[PDB]
Amino acid sequence: VRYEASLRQLEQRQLAKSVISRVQSELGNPKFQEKVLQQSISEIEQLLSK
Amino acid sequence: PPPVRLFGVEGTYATALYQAAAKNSSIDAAFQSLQKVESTVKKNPKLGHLLLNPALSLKDRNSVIDAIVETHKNLDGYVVNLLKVLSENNRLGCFEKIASDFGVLNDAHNGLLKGTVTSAEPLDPKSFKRIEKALSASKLVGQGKSLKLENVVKPEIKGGLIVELGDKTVDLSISTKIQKLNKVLED
Amino acid sequence: EVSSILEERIKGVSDEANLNETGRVLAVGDGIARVFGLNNIQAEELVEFSSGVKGMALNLEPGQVGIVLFGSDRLVKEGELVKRTGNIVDVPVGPGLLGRVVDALGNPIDGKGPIDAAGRSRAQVKAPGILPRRSVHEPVQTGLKAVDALVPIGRGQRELIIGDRQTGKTAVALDTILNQKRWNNGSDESKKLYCVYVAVGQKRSTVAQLVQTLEQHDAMKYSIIVAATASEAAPLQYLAPFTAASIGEWFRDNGKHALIVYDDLSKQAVAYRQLSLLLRRPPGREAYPGDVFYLHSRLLERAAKLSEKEGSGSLTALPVIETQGGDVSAYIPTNVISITDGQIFLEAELFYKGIRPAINVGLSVSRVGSAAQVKALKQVAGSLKLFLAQYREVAAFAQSDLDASTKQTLVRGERLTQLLKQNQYSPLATEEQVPLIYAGVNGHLDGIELSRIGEFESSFLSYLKSNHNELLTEIREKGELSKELLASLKSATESFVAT
Amino acid sequence: TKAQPTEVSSILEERIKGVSDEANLNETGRVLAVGDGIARVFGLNNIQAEELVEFSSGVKGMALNLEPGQV
Amino acid sequence: AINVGLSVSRVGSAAQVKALKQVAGSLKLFLAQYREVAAFAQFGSDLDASTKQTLVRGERLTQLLKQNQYSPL
Amino acid sequence: PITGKVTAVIGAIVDVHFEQSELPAILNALEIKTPQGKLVLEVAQHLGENTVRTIAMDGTEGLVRGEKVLDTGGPISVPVGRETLGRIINVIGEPIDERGPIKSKLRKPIHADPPSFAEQSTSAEILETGIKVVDLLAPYARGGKIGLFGGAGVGKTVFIQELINNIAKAHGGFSVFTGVGERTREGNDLYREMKETGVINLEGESKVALVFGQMNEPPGARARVALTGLTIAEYFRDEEGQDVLLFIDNIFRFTQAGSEVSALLGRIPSAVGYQPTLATDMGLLQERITTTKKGSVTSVQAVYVPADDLTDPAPATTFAHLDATTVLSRGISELGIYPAVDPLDSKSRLLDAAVVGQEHYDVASKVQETLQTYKSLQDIIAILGMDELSEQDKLTVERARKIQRFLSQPFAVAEVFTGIPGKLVRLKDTVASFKAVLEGKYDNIPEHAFYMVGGIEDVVAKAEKLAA
Amino acid sequence: STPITGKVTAVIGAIVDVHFEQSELPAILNALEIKTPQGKLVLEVAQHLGENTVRTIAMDGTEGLVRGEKVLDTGGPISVPVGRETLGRIINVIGEPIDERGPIKSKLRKPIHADPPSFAEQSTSAEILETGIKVVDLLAPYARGGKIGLFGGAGVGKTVFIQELINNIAKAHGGFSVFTGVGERTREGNDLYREMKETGVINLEGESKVALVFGQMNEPPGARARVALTGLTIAEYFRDEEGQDVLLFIDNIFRFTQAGSEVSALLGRIPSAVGYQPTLATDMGLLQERITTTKKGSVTSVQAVYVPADDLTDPAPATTFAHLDATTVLSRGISELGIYPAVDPLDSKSRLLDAAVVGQEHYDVASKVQETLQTYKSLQDIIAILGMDELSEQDKLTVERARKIQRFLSQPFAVAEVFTGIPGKLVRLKDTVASFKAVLEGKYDNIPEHAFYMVGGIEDVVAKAEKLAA
């Protein structure tokens, strides 16, 4: 009964580490180039408005 | 006069040097001579090691000054009055610290801004220019003070970028977002 | 499943670009990060980190501005952003914190009910004027007979509950909150004290009893419990009495009353000490800072009974002060004692002697006191002060046998003392406090054995409800005893004493 | 390295701007930090021990600590 | 100088000789009771037999206890 | 004047750095423009390089380094005159009471230098009141310091009110009641009470002017309020030649606040946990209080003990300055005697043969002696019983009880409660009464028939009325 | 980039400073390790002083720390082992076995730090501990959830008290336990280790009913501090993940307070409360909150506490008194009188004592006792001066029952077979309530004082009436 209760929490924790697992793929893939740049241009649009 | 006062940690010396040569408008000349004498101190290994180490007597610090001015041409006599004032006060412990703080004073008063554009990666020259403009639109950079920016690669940001200057930043780094993404999947 | 709820929340989080002024930690130690930058920044203004820690700026100086960290030192490192939120510490105030246990920050930590807010008001404000004031004359009933008659309680009237450690300090206080349930049930909202209990540097285990006991008696639907616990850091504990009073101000300004019970200023002081010593502030008495006085004084002068202009409302207060065996000559007790008007001083001996509450009412005085007192209770217990007062001094004579006079005084005092021994967490109405004391005064209770006192109390009460609950309701609502009620009241005690 | 009370920007700016390091440190002083009932004058290096100095304000005081750079 | 009133061993004993434990068996209680009785004894109050028993016993022991410099035995 | 930018905000200690020429002089008042009203800061050191170190008078919140500062040219200037009376003012000389800007023809600085040697109280002076007990056994003096003792709300308020009332009749004078460590709830009550008993009038001028120093204002605003009331008093003395009476509240909370001012400035707070500049500050305060040739400020101050100790540094420094002590107690009040004065604990160091003439001293000694002998006798007279009284012994009992009752004033301040018309009994007329009672020329007049009357004239009436 | 190189800069006792390289960015609460002949010296970062330079506390010796010697960065707090296979092994403060039977078995590890459980997690008590000691059981019983504290001076049998509770209570309950030794002598460890090995609470196979964590005082002040955080972590693991009640024990927790006080001055944090760490409230506060009853396990600690100078109106014990639920007070005098244990009858107090929680009869009986003794103590003054025959007959009888009660606190123990030599007793909660009551009702004043001396339960009291008569 205790461990079953614990298990619903663990299930979420497995999805936490999974974020890390996609993170690895981003820095290996040319997402490392393209999304850094998605990030860059938005900063350009916000800062021009100041 | 200074563009803003800086006090303590051997910057009271820098403020005093700046203001002294500023009232005589011989600040380019101060910068040039200081760069020259520092440049030859830094690229001589033990002289750039044991001069910051304040293991000398009174009499010896004075004898140091005399050896330093052989490598100096004597281009300005004020940064040489700085060597004399340090030797009399019984220190030579921080040299690039006095220098660096003075470096900030001269080019800020002149109007030159120092930004950083940390990114995880090399970026477009298009980007530099676009950002340079983004800044000019805004009040950080209005001219009366130039713009320089340095793209750096630090794996301390592992995607995205951070713009910094005049303590106003725009922070679109992927790391901080990865941290909040964790937080919600930990309920 | 759960993931879906979280999925809902995730989408509601986006990339945020624009941020204002910033600083970078130069060195961080002992919860004292020291920041480079933040030139132009308000005094004691809030900062938010890049690792999501919060801070306040006690130290402003040009070289470095010395932030004080509220959270962890493990998420703060060297070279980290410190965004300037641009808002001095202020916390939400509303009516919605009724029935809500909140942390020092105002969010629900029990996980029950949302915070319905309307404004955010600063933790530190400044105390109203001279013209925003009116004399204290409003009673308040605590349900203990002794406190309401000998050293009455009032509205915007603060007076101590200073006593020894685990002698039922909390029981003196708890009885009052539970009694404020009486006004709450009706609908005249200028008589409703919306109570706040402020647990400062007092652990979550102790508080869990505090909440549990409230819940059983159905009293988490107006009580508010602001908690900065033993584990929670010195800023939160330092700011816990300031956050709690401010919630009370919304009620007070809208024209209402509310009541704040601080527990305990002995622990508020300890937190200021921790802060001072790490920021190397001047030393003082007992190794606590010299400037502690200023802290307490600012908090206690906002507790006041305002003009009719300000809606005819007040912030009533009752600080609880923890003593080290009854020392009042101690630097932190001594400050508070002068500031506040009145004290109640509990005694260790009474406790051991099995009388609980161990409130000792000889060494209790209220400076303002009976100006706030029910008329009914003033008549039948003027006498009551003079009877108990003699009995103490005449109880410095001990048994063989004594003068005919001296022995009489002990008999009268003792029956009254057993009457005023009551079980804890049991409040009393005005209609049941007033009949009993009259029995003591008029010596129909002091003619009856000590052992049978406890019995007499309930029987007499039931006897009055069965025959004539008209006289009780009349007593209560008039608030006073008239010659026609005083005739009757003697008649009734006689029939009851007969049986 | 060491912190010194001779890091005063008004003193320092004048020493640096010549070979001159002030002739106002002989038989004259100029006041700096003063109040708390104790005062700090910069210079006075020709002075005697337990001497009287008269300040141009109509107040006179007695040198207690003759220190190298201040009295 | 020696005082036995404020002389304790927290853990408890086991390090003495077997023979010395028996002989001093109740010596500890006598001396500890005696102090209290001795204090009462000085007011000059009349004392009952239970109190004077303890007072007569205790006193004699205390005189045993007393020693002179340089007697190893 | 010169302008500069705030360069620190540590605690309530704000350092301001000014454009290079000179700095403010010490004790000057600086004004900060902010959306928190104004904040008046007082310079208590010069750090050098055109920078200062200041104490605050108004809470330190809503400051930013870089706010422009202004130098007034000297101390904080408080209004003075007779257009400021009956109105409550905080440390900056502006209303708390919200009756509209407190302004007058002239302002004067809170810090001043004490008068010359020549212009001090150099010969004896006598300050006449209406109370018999004060005027016989402890004569109030001009430039005299009398340290009040006992608690608040048992007679204390009644006593303060009385003397304010006496002064108007005696001279035409004024008073300023200064409250240090004042609680704001209590302050409203004192101003409303002071109106009722007739010493503050809602229409024009009044008598007493009120100065309150709240605890929700920094330690400096508690410290400088005493100075704020003094300036008002002095204006009457110097330029209108009128005698004044200047109260202080608790002198513990003047001490408590000054410790914080010391510790904060850089200084060490050592003096058994209090300031080492304590003696010297009381010296400045209580040496501007004196009799000048045109007028005189006299001061009544209040002693609060730290834990029932007269051996502590703060009680001790006060006791040296003080020339008399007046001791109110509750026991006296419960025997129906208002003033609450204790004639056994009523003493002055200006009660002498050559200070109040010979007659005044010698009657006072007897009046003291009767009551002392009555007390010694009374110890064994109660125990033995009231019939083991001697003929000799009962002669001391009888005289004392005549004196005990006779002291009482049915005075104007506590008039409502007893119902009996007010009394002012002058100093000469106090002495005279006591002479006839000493020779027993009223041993035909019953003991209890000395009840609630003043001078010699007064008790002629009560004697008849008891018989009738 | 994170350097794996630091060079030591200043060894000034326990304080060890490191000079890390470019880009390190130091963070507090990390662990630096230095290779040394005495193993791996662990340094817990407790400040960064700026520019890549930490000021750290040592957990191992610095009488052989060489300057210039490479300092790795490990990161975060150290990780000990937890499980159920971590029972009946002796675990060092740095997490290493000094019981020398290969490594301390693992499944999972967690660090010596843990965040304190939130308000929502907390839950009340509902079970009542029974110790089997008649004074504790009537006048202040403990309940699971509690933070018990054994306040006393020195010489009042502190270890012996702690020993008694393990001899009874530990076997009894269905849960496992954790025994943590903070800063204690090499004699005491060995005494605990032999006595309970024999009693089978320590077993060489895992899955015991105690754990042992010995941290000792001949190790630097930082180690004494973090022996406690280490043992505690085993108990949290029980409580949450493995869902078992713990009957935790810590000893002496003053060594924990005293330890923080030593490294407090040197880290720059000027003393407060006079000679003590200014962080006294919060360090306690964090410690105490971990030990509680939540949604699963109930970790009920028994903590020894040392009162210095035998005076308990001193700031270090007084702060603590607040932090602990169910205080007891012990003293030199009572122990010497022959009354075992030295627990005082009126000064043993719980905040877990209610009239309903321990039942009405129990409450009423313990109140009568508190009254009768208190009359006895008021009468002591009268009896000293006036004499004993100038007392009323009601008074004289109260003196007499109070004497019977006073000697009815005396029970010998097995672990105090170094004092009396008579084994221990087990006394059930109902049996204490009934036998005290009988004295007070006047029906059991036929029994003398010495027949309540050295007794167990009720059956015993009857047995001793016969023995003395013959």
Tab-separated table of C-alpha atoms in Angstrom, chain F residues 97-347:
chain	number	residue	atom	x	y	z
F	97	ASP	CA	-3.038	66.221	15.336
F	98	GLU	CA	-3.958	67.325	11.761
F	99	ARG	CA	-5.360	70.812	12.722
F	100	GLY	CA	-3.501	72.529	9.926
F	101	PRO	CA	0.083	73.710	9.511
F	102	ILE	CA	1.679	74.624	12.740
F	103	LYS	CA	3.459	77.888	11.857
F	104	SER	CA	4.164	81.010	13.876
F	105	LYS	CA	5.971	84.341	13.322
F	106	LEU	CA	9.345	82.856	14.391
F	107	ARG	CA	11.171	79.465	14.301
F	108	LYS	CA	14.353	78.759	16.393
F	109	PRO	CA	16.954	75.906	16.167
F	110	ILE	CA	16.593	72.741	18.459
F	111	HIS	CA	20.231	72.945	19.354
F	112	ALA	CA	21.478	75.962	21.161
F	113	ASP	CA	24.485	76.787	23.429
F	114	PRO	CA	23.683	77.130	27.253
F	115	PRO	CA	23.761	80.717	28.753
F	116	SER	CA	26.929	82.316	30.250
F	117	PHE	CA	28.223	81.711	33.684
F	118	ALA	CA	26.914	85.198	34.733
F	119	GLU	CA	23.396	84.393	33.472
F	120	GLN	CA	22.933	81.062	35.306
F	121	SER	CA	20.996	80.521	38.560
F	122	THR	CA	23.608	82.042	40.829
F	123	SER	CA	21.506	82.897	43.873
F	124	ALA	CA	18.501	81.050	45.302
F	125	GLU	CA	14.951	81.366	43.925
F	126	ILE	CA	11.621	80.092	44.922
F	127	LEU	CA	8.833	78.980	42.571
F	128	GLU	CA	5.508	79.260	44.224
F	129	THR	CA	2.649	76.734	43.587
F	130	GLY	CA	-0.745	75.950	45.157
F	131	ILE	CA	0.066	72.667	46.760
F	132	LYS	CA	0.887	72.682	50.546
F	133	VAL	CA	2.970	69.483	50.566
F	134	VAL	CA	5.392	70.627	47.697
F	135	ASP	CA	5.746	74.158	49.063
F	136	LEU	CA	6.587	73.115	52.613
F	137	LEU	CA	8.607	69.975	52.427
F	138	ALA	CA	10.322	70.215	49.037
F	139	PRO	CA	10.114	73.838	47.686
F	140	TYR	CA	10.019	74.045	43.904
F	141	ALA	CA	12.650	76.368	42.702
F	142	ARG	CA	13.292	78.269	39.610
F	143	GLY	CA	15.814	76.416	37.264
F	144	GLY	CA	15.096	73.477	39.748
F	145	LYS	CA	15.034	69.860	38.646
F	146	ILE	CA	12.404	67.768	40.499
F	147	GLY	CA	12.333	64.117	39.459
F	148	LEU	CA	8.830	62.635	39.598
F	149	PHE	CA	8.403	59.048	40.702
F	150	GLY	CA	5.538	56.544	40.503
F	151	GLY	CA	3.253	55.140	37.748
F	152	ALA	CA	0.907	56.683	35.234
F	153	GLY	CA	-2.842	56.848	35.617
F	154	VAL	CA	-3.105	56.760	39.514
F	155	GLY	CA	-2.663	60.450	39.997
F	156	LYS	CA	0.151	61.210	37.687
F	157	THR	CA	-1.985	63.042	35.079
F	158	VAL	CA	-3.782	64.943	37.918
F	159	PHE	CA	-0.499	66.139	39.341
F	160	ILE	CA	0.796	67.462	35.939
F	161	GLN	CA	-2.374	69.217	35.125
F	162	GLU	CA	-2.462	70.954	38.499
F	163	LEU	CA	0.912	72.631	38.241
F	164	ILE	CA	0.172	73.867	34.621
F	165	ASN	CA	-2.970	75.442	36.111
F	166	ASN	CA	-1.052	77.135	39.060
F	167	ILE	CA	1.537	78.769	36.767
F	168	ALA	CA	-1.003	80.843	34.799
F	169	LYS	CA	-2.261	82.430	38.027
F	170	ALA	CA	1.224	82.911	39.436
F	171	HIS	CA	2.896	84.488	36.469
F	172	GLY	CA	0.962	84.179	33.200
F	173	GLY	CA	3.071	81.450	32.114
F	174	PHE	CA	3.032	78.476	29.895
F	175	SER	CA	4.275	74.893	30.030
F	176	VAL	CA	5.238	72.371	27.363
F	177	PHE	CA	4.592	68.731	28.033
F	178	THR	CA	7.092	66.662	26.176
F	179	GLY	CA	6.485	62.919	25.845
F	180	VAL	CA	9.366	60.721	25.046
F	181	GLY	CA	8.626	57.017	24.350
F	182	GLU	CA	4.997	58.128	23.746
F	183	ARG	CA	2.419	55.526	22.749
F	184	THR	CA	-0.004	57.005	20.145
F	185	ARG	CA	-3.171	55.433	21.737
F	186	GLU	CA	-2.358	57.147	25.090
F	187	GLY	CA	-1.445	60.407	23.369
F	188	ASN	CA	-4.968	60.995	22.030
F	189	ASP	CA	-6.361	60.302	25.517
F	190	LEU	CA	-3.928	62.849	27.170
F	191	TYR	CA	-4.833	65.618	24.611
F	192	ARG	CA	-8.696	64.949	25.119
F	193	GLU	CA	-8.303	64.791	28.927
F	194	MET	CA	-6.173	67.970	28.850
F	195	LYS	CA	-9.000	69.692	27.027
F	196	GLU	CA	-11.632	68.624	29.534
F	197	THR	CA	-9.735	69.800	32.662
F	198	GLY	CA	-9.323	73.310	31.133
F	199	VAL	CA	-5.682	73.681	30.275
F	200	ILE	CA	-6.081	73.379	26.459
F	201	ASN	CA	-8.830	75.324	24.756
F	202	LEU	CA	-10.209	74.498	21.328
F	203	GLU	CA	-10.637	78.280	20.544
F	204	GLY	CA	-7.292	80.200	20.232
F	205	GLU	CA	-4.568	80.147	22.833
F	206	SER	CA	-4.145	77.667	25.543
F	207	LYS	CA	-1.560	76.988	28.366
F	208	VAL	CA	0.473	73.768	27.674
F	209	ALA	CA	1.856	72.830	24.255
F	210	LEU	CA	2.259	69.215	23.525
F	211	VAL	CA	5.247	67.527	22.030
F	212	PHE	CA	4.987	63.787	21.308
F	213	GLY	CA	7.781	61.465	20.262
F	214	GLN	CA	6.172	58.227	18.949
F	215	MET	CA	8.045	54.924	18.854
F	216	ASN	CA	7.077	54.339	15.281
F	217	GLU	CA	9.617	57.226	14.440
F	218	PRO	CA	13.405	56.396	14.707
F	219	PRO	CA	15.530	56.741	17.991
F	220	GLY	CA	16.586	60.213	16.992
F	221	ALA	CA	12.976	61.472	17.074
F	222	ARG	CA	12.634	60.179	20.610
F	223	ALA	CA	15.963	61.959	21.509
F	224	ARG	CA	15.427	65.345	19.928
F	225	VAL	CA	11.792	65.897	21.154
F	226	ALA	CA	13.166	66.942	24.596
F	227	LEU	CA	15.142	69.732	22.721
F	228	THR	CA	12.107	70.602	20.624
F	229	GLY	CA	9.950	71.524	23.702
F	230	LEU	CA	12.920	73.407	25.369
F	231	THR	CA	13.129	75.856	22.464
F	232	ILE	CA	9.504	76.939	22.995
F	233	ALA	CA	10.003	77.527	26.728
F	234	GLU	CA	13.128	79.629	26.110
F	235	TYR	CA	11.340	81.904	23.700
F	236	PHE	CA	9.068	83.004	26.572
F	237	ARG	CA	11.946	83.273	28.901
F	238	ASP	CA	14.358	85.316	26.692
F	239	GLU	CA	11.975	87.496	24.672
F	240	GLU	CA	8.827	87.689	26.696
F	241	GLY	CA	10.417	87.224	30.277
F	242	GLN	CA	7.860	84.530	31.401
F	243	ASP	CA	8.519	81.512	33.714
F	244	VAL	CA	7.761	78.036	32.210
F	245	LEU	CA	7.638	74.361	33.472
F	246	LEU	CA	8.926	71.785	31.267
F	247	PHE	CA	7.973	68.174	31.787
F	248	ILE	CA	9.742	65.145	30.445
F	249	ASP	CA	8.186	61.673	30.584
F	250	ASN	CA	10.157	58.630	31.356
F	251	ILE	CA	13.994	59.250	31.455
F	252	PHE	CA	14.581	55.537	30.872
F	253	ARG	CA	13.177	55.875	27.354
F	254	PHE	CA	15.471	59.071	26.718
F	255	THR	CA	18.353	56.760	27.796
F	256	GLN	CA	17.036	53.740	25.662
F	257	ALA	CA	16.805	55.704	22.505
F	258	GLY	CA	20.250	57.499	23.025
F	259	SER	CA	21.993	54.036	23.236
F	260	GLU	CA	20.827	53.224	19.752
F	261	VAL	CA	22.054	56.641	18.430
F	262	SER	CA	25.533	55.835	19.875
F	263	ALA	CA	25.896	52.313	18.757
F	264	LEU	CA	24.799	53.094	15.213
F	265	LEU	CA	27.101	56.111	14.525
F	266	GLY	CA	30.303	54.009	14.785
F	267	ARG	CA	30.666	54.486	18.458
F	268	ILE	CA	30.689	51.634	21.045
F	269	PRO	CA	27.499	51.467	23.343
F	270	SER	CA	29.424	50.621	26.570
F	271	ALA	CA	28.136	52.063	29.898
F	272	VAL	CA	26.572	48.868	31.170
F	273	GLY	CA	24.880	48.476	27.771
F	274	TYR	CA	24.069	52.160	27.168
F	275	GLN	CA	25.867	55.129	25.619
F	276	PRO	CA	29.227	56.515	27.109
F	277	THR	CA	28.112	60.041	26.091
F	278	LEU	CA	25.121	59.894	28.372
F	279	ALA	CA	26.399	62.213	31.159
F	280	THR	CA	27.511	64.845	28.639
F	281	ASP	CA	24.162	64.778	26.894
F	282	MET	CA	22.202	65.351	30.195
F	283	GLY	CA	24.795	68.070	30.813
F	284	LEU	CA	23.763	69.920	27.562
F	285	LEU	CA	20.069	69.290	28.313
F	286	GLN	CA	19.900	70.371	31.930
F	287	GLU	CA	22.331	73.312	31.781
F	288	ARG	CA	20.186	75.389	29.243
F	289	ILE	CA	17.527	74.938	31.944
F	290	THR	CA	18.105	77.745	34.331
F	291	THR	CA	17.108	81.212	35.575
F	292	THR	CA	18.170	83.996	33.377
F	293	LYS	CA	17.552	87.623	34.268
F	294	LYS	CA	14.422	87.926	32.236
F	295	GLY	CA	12.690	84.632	33.011
F	296	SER	CA	13.260	81.086	33.938
F	297	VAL	CA	12.526	77.502	32.556
F	298	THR	CA	12.177	74.978	35.426
F	299	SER	CA	12.050	71.256	34.704
F	300	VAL	CA	10.058	68.378	36.179
F	301	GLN	CA	11.480	65.094	34.772
F	302	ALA	CA	10.292	61.560	35.338
F	303	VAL	CA	12.402	58.718	36.683
F	304	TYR	CA	11.541	55.098	35.538
F	305	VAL	CA	13.858	52.554	37.260
F	306	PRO	CA	15.271	49.665	35.044
F	307	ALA	CA	14.396	46.781	37.264
F	308	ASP	CA	13.929	48.544	40.751
F	309	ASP	CA	17.474	49.608	40.968
F	310	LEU	CA	18.820	53.024	42.238
F	311	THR	CA	22.380	51.661	41.851
F	312	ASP	CA	22.289	51.509	37.917
F	313	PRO	CA	24.222	54.106	35.706
F	314	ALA	CA	21.091	55.766	34.239
F	315	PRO	CA	19.336	56.367	37.670
F	316	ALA	CA	22.635	57.455	39.100
F	317	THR	CA	23.422	60.166	36.416
F	318	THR	CA	19.916	61.527	36.798
F	319	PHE	CA	20.151	61.656	40.670
F	320	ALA	CA	23.173	63.940	40.607
F	321	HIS	CA	21.376	66.606	38.395
F	322	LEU	CA	18.149	66.461	40.364
F	323	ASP	CA	17.737	68.891	43.285
F	324	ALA	CA	14.420	67.557	44.680
F	325	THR	CA	12.311	64.375	44.441
F	326	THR	CA	8.511	64.299	44.728
F	327	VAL	CA	7.101	60.816	45.349
F	328	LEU	CA	3.497	60.029	44.357
F	329	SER	CA	2.100	56.730	45.681
F	330	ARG	CA	-1.138	54.860	45.651
F	331	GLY	CA	-1.405	54.294	49.412
F	332	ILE	CA	-2.051	57.932	49.886
F	333	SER	CA	-4.737	58.014	47.233
F	334	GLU	CA	-6.685	55.216	48.882
F	335	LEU	CA	-6.934	57.269	52.147
F	336	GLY	CA	-8.717	60.014	50.100
F	337	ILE	CA	-5.805	62.416	49.908
F	338	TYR	CA	-5.278	64.107	46.484
F	339	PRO	CA	-2.225	65.306	45.813
F	340	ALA	CA	-0.735	61.788	46.083
F	341	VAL	CA	2.425	63.151	47.572
F	342	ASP	CA	4.319	61.330	50.233
F	343	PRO	CA	5.451	63.774	52.910
F	344	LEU	CA	7.920	61.269	54.161
F	345	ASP	CA	9.539	60.892	50.755
F	346	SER	CA	9.164	64.722	49.926
F	347	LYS	CA	12.679	66.139	49.934
